[PDB]
Write a protein that binds this ligand. Structure first.
Ligand SMILES: [Cl-]
Ligand SMILES: [Cl-]
Ligand SMILES: [Cl-]
Ligand code: NA
Ligand code: NA
Lengths: 150, 169
């Protein structure tokens, strides 16, 4: 089987499980020697690789941070920091749209996506530009969509 | 005043400091003591400099929609969700959709972005992809020159170079 095995010395020797690299090919005495990937390294396949793949750095200069895989078996994702979203056209993190007064941010907020803004409905207001703040209820004592009752 | 509304509250003729995001007002200030501000409990949050006697409860990210919480333990901000690995939030359906798979000869642009669809790009000469995958980038060809071997099979953007096992003089 090509999936679990490679051929060497006229026999089918076993490939390395995801998370492990092929340190030594099989011998006339031994099957393959497979060792765990080091820090920030991975292999997500049954393989014959002589080294693990290194996770791409998430560039802090682009406002990116790492999303932890909690394993050595998955490729690692990055994401824009809270309040920012990845734009594939600029290939850059943009500030999330601030919903103007009279509008509120829709929840739940989606990581790495821009804010959806919706108008405050009767009985609710928003007095700030914010990419996170929902519309707030009027305090019970005239209010508008942009201002609380006085 | 100079008791700044942004960071303070008035109580019994005194200027007292509001609690930081992530903490709630356990007890108001006294003549010889500050505000007692204590952390919000598990699953709870407050996202403003506040004078709240209790914190708000986080809603779970909807697993039925294939969403997962990011930094679920954050007490200082409203919760953010993201589609599970291999899926992206689609704004048209407001839902998680399976990531685009890059065909053989194409690779995923790295680093992969959480909650975003895979962007697929052609493998350059010297690199290949033999599978449909929303994660795999193009892999460099095996280097037979490095080993001083001849090639048994020419590489393509869809298949790896294969080195000969034969020796030459
Ligand atoms: Cl990676
Ligand atoms: Cl707006
Ligand atoms: Cl929340
Ligand atoms: Na607003
Ligand atoms: Na591919």
């Amino acid at each position: 089987t090509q999936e679990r095995h490679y051929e060497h010395l006229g026999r089918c020797c076993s490939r390395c499980e995801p998370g492990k690299y092929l340190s030594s090919k099989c011998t006339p005495t031994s099957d393959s020697v497979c060792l765990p990937c080091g820090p920030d390294e991975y292999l997500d396949t049954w393989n014959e690789e002589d080294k693990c793949l290194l996770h791409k750095v998430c560039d802090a200069g682009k406002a990116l941070v790492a999303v932890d895989p909690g394993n050595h078996t998955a490729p690692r994702r990055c994401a824009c920091t809270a309040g920012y979203h990845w734009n594939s056209d600029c290939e850059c993190c943009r500030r999330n749209t601030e919903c103007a007064p009279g509008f509120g941010a829709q929840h739940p907020l989606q990581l790495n996506k821009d804010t959806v803004c919706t108008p405050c409905l009767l009985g609710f207001f928003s007095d700030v530009f914010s990419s996170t703040d929902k519309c707030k209820p009027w305090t019970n004592c005239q209010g508008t969509t942009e201002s609380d009752v006085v």
